[PDB]
Amino acid sequence: FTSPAVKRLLGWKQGDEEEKWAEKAVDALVKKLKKKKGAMEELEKALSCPGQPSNCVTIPRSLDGRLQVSHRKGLPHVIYCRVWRWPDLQSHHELKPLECCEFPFGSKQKEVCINPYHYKRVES
Amino acid sequence: TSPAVKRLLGWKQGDEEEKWAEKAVDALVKKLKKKKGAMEELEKALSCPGQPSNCVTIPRSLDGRLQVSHRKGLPHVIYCRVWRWPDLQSHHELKPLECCEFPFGSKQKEVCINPYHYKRVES
DNA sequence: ATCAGTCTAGACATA
DNA sequence: GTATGTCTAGACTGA
Ligand SMILES: [Zn+2]
Ligand SMILES: [Zn+2]
Fold first, then answer.
1. Residue A91 contacts strand D, CB under 7 A
2. Rounded CA gap, B19 and B15, in Å?
3. What is the Cα Rg of chain A in Å?
4. Which of A13, A44, A46, A77 has the fewest CB atoms inside 10 Å of its own CB, making it the most exposed?
């Protein structure tokens, strides 16, 4: 919770390189998800009701696994998990897929799931 | 041209266009080093314009364009601007010489970028 | 329609 | 076998 005066002031806050980039990455993901009925709704369900189980929300997997957004390359699940869960997330080594996930990064299928709540954070 | 002047000109700032053209030449050299005779041949053509030279080609893309540092153009146009007509407008101002066996229009695997394998025309 | 421009997966290179 | 970053043809998108 935030004070109205404060959230107004925060309205004018400058976002940094990282936050500006993350917006680009979300923009990129939405372009993909609009093309699939149920995806946008589903992802919004997952983000809004974390406690309640949700479906896989996938994008095409590249040959090397990486995704490029505005001249940065990363791994998709890592990217989106940083955005919506663990901003300080280090690498894919700090992530394990839940059993409920049908399309986890490691499975190297056509599709890769980017539902942040289909992943759990770990050590290594 | 004077030594003091060329010294002073040493410190001249190149503009976006010239800096880009340096990149485009760099890009072309990377390609030509890989082909024995190409670099020498291109140098022959540039240095002895009067004397006939061979085709110097690079791979042709599907759409014909070449990209160098986030700018797209047509290769013969690019390299003709560099070494001949800086004010060259488009491929419409260019016609290939008969001596050229890989001219832009021929839409082959290779496209010739020897600037002296082209002549400048109106539109 | 050409034409012109943006974005990135795949290739490739510097580690 | 990683990994990280760069470049650009091709795919795509608007005049
Ligand atoms: Zn999933
Ligand atoms: Zn030629």
1. yes
2. 6
3. 15
4. A13
Number of domains in chain A: 1
- Residue B113 sits in a domain whose CATH number is 3.90.520.10
Q: Residue A111 contacts by C-beta under 8 Å, 6 or more apart in sequence?
A: A56, A58, A59, A60, A61, A103
Q: Which of residues 25-54 of B touch strand D (CB under 7 A)?
A: 27
Structural domain harbouring B1: 1-123
For residue A105, which ligand has an atom nearest its CA?
1
Q: Is A40 helix (H, G, I), strand (E, B) or coil?
A: helix
Distance separating alpha carbons of residues B77 and B92, to the nearest angstrom: 10
Q: A73: Cβ under 7 Å from strand D? A: yes
> Which ligand does the CA of A56 lie closest to?
1
Which residue in the block uniquely carries the two structure tokens 């369900």?
A45
Residue pointed to by tokens 């364009």: B65
- Say if CB A2 and CB A13 are below 8 A apart: no
Bridge partners, A60 (sequence order): A111
Q: What experimental approach yielded this model? A: X-ray
Resolution for the entry shown, Å: 2.7
